[PDB]
Ligand binder design. Sequence first.
Ligand SMILES: [Ca+2]
Ligand SMILES: [Ca+2]
Length: 677
Amino acid sequence: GCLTPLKPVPSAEQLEWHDMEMYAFVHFTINTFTGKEWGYGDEKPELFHPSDFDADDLVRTLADAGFKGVVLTCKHHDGFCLWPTKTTLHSVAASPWKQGKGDVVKEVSRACGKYGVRFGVYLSPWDRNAASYGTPDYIRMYRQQLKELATGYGSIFLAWFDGANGGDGYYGGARERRSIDRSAYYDWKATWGELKKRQPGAVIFSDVGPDVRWVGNESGYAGYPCWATYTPVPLQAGTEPAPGTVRYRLGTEGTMDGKYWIPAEVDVSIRPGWFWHEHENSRVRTPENLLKLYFDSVGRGANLNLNVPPDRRGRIHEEDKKSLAGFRVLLDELYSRNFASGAQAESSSSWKGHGAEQVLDRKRTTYWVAAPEDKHPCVVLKLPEPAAFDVIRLAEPIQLGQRVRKFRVEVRENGQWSKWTEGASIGARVLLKGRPVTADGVRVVLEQSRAVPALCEVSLWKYPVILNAPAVNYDRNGRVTLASAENVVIRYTTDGTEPGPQSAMYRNPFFLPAGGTVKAAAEYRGRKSSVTTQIIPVPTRDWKVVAGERSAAAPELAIDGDSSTLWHTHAAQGELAPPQALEIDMGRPVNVAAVIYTPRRDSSTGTVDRYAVYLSMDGNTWGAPAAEGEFSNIRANPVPQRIDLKAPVKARYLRFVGKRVVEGSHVAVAELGVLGK
Ligand SMILES: [Ca+2]
Ligand SMILES: [Ca+2]
């Protein structure tokens, strides 16, 4: 079955790149040691002194996360080079890292070889230290740097050519603004030709790059359809397309029937900034985020390039490693069971031996092709029994072209077929997520295509369960109800320990008539979730309101357990001013140790700041205040406030006196509770 291709087609190196699916950035240079996202160029190389670098750890941590390549920023915009280049001493050769000089590029490419992951380079065309930048001599220097990187560090699978500029820089002390004709300065054709002479197996990235294109954003999403084909058009009509001179937002979806084959890379950072920042340790993308990113990039037909910036300790930070390990666990669960492996494949037609069955081995080299006859080609998978799934994966033999243009996927439930998902492009691969179904039949219908269609993979998958922390709710009876999105086991503790994997399971609403602390956690297939911790106050069903201004709002709205219900003293007669008091008969002698005041959410009107609480056992003699003070920072942060008693008191009657407020001049209590440890 030697079938006729559909121009354009990818090359062998582009096919390998596609099959990689995903790979990593490592933004690491002197800016990592300045705190800047873009360096100026005046940095002393003294400042590149990573304490405890270790490249094996770096590459291994990335490879365990499933990334198949590492792209190192060998020189970023600041112009400082991570290897002892012969073009400048604004390199590691000047740094105290190592006795004078080591070589980060050598170590990272060596570890990439050590762990079977590809190695690629980023060499910023815009050099902000080279005093020759703007003159042809900088082009000579840049060509020598590219030769050095492409001569002594093994195979390079991708070279990353950033088209971004921005003008000013140190430029060897010039401290000047320089601009270059981006569409002609770097003379890209010859530089890239020489590079691909000494690295025939490499792939060129840039906004136009003859091999891989930029997705046109840095937020981490390609657009569906994300055609691999692409025809760059310039920003300024007439100029010649080049990195930084093309309508780049068009690179988010590609071009329908393009003239060239430049598939898309989704470069995105695990953190807001491309380089390591300490104040971003709390903003590292969660594994669920990274999986969503994986779909919105890989599962749309593009490839993923996640940036993991080593800190200025020279290591991937602990948060980054935690998130990467979680992301690997989630990708592994996603591909635990292929609900198509074991199925039968049928087709509306076939051509010269490429039968339907050929889509079950997931291999991109074996494929089904329809006959140039039926205008509605289709592929049916029949399953051994109804199976629970929600994700389909489709793939084309892209080496023969990209053919599918509009397509749908129908599922068979309860004996009947209904439409489940649809789309436009397939290309390298597409992950379609639909409604969760229990089905034993899948139909892929290729509605329209320019050339006789073909598929190399049809596989079925269950999207991993998002383990959201358990909701812990309670009524005025102490009846506690735990809940979560379905199909999760919930463990819980009431003493104060953390919910270990051997803690009490949740089953039905349980009781806690003393007031305490609940800590719950969700579980599914060995993977845990965040721990919800909730303090349950004492029951309030025997509580009656003994004293409190009624002519405006019913005081029972402050002990009804609903924070969205409001007691106030803002009657149509007047804004009756503080102090406003609530005397509560608790119905039973309670051993109170804390008082909870829940203010209103939407406003700061009526919220109290200075408070007094009296306790008694007859409601007639109160005495000195049982507690006393202010609610510091309740204006900007109106949340439930806790009055811890200096010493626990046993009492039946409680008087809460709001003495004065934050804004307005009536008192407003949303809820009022009591804790008795
Ligand atoms: Ca196949
Ligand atoms: Ca209330």
